[PDB]
Each structure stands twice: as C-alpha cells, then as structure tokens.
Amino acid sequence: KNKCVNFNFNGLTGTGVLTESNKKFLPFQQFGRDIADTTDAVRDPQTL
Amino acid sequence: QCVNLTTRTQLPPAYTNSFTRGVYYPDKVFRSSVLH
Amino acid sequence: LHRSSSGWTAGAAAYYVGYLQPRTFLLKYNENGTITDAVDC
Numbered sequence: 541k542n543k544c545v546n547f548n549f550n551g552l553t554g555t556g557v558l559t560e561s562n563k564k565f566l567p568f569q570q571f572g573r574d575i576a577d578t579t580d581a582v583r584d585p586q587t588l
Numbered sequence: 589q590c591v592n593l594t595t596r597t598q599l600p601p602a603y604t605n606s607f608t609r610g611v612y613y614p615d616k617v618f619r620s621s622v623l624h
Numbered sequence: 625l626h627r628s629s630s631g632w633t634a635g636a637a638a639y640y641v642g643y644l645q646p647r648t649f650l651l652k653y654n655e656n657g658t659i660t661d662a663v664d665c
Contacts (some may be wrong), residue, residue, distance in 0.1 A: 571615070571617045572618035575624075595633055608643070611649060
C-alpha cells in the first residue's frame with residue numbers, strides 16, 4: 541500500500557497507488573470506474 | 589414419458605403490458621450519481 | 625404437479641414470457657449501487 545505499484549488483474553492492466561477507501565462495493569461487482577471511463581477503485585479478490 | 593395429460597386446457601396467446609421491468613447490470617462496474 | 629399417470633394436477637401459480645431486443649438503457653446509480661430508474665431510448 542501507499543506506493544506506486546503495477547497491479548496485474550486477470551482482466552485489467554495498469555499502474556497506480558493502492559490505499560484505504562470509504563466506499564462499499566456490491567458482493568457480485570469487482571470493478572469501479574469514474575465518469576469519463578477511469579478505473580479508480582477495485583475490490584481485492586483475497587480479502588473482502 | 590410419452591403419455592399426455594387429460595387436464596390440459598387450450599388458451600389464446602394474449603398480451604400483458606410491462607411498465608419498467610427488465611433492467612439488469614450489463615457489467616460489474618461500480619459508479620455513483622452518474623447516468624451512462 | 626400433484627395428486628391428492630394422467631390424473632396429476634398443478635397448484636396455483638403464473639409465469640409470463642417476454643422477448644429481448646438490443647436496445648440502449650441508462651443506468652442511474654445511487655451511493656450504494658442500486659439501480660433506481662432506467663431510461664429506454
């Protein structure tokens with residue numbers, strides 16, 4: 541956390557910084573994007 | 589297996605109008621207060 | 625079916641079958657992610 545890392549998802553590629561969040565995703569959804577198609581929050585597959 | 593029933597009643601194929609049903613999630617993208 | 629091979633009978637239910645079309649919808653998400661209203665173009 542809190543470092544410029546390169547996350548490697550099964551269907552998503554890109555770099556970013558992982559940190560804490562205040563949102564709450566749905567139990568079936570895994571992705572989260574901004575208005576102009578910008579992925580800014582994903583759910584961790586290991587820990588909910 | 590092949591024996592048909594005797595309590596079958598023929599019905600005409602009528603119609604029924606829906607109002608706002610039939611909406612699901614096309615993907616697993618979480619957004620808030622948008623309209624895409 | 626129930627029976628209180630052709631003397632069986634059903635209960636009391638209903639089911640309707642529709643048809644889909646490749647249309648365009650609008651998704652209005654709230655703070656929790658539940659769809660509140662949709663717009664058929």
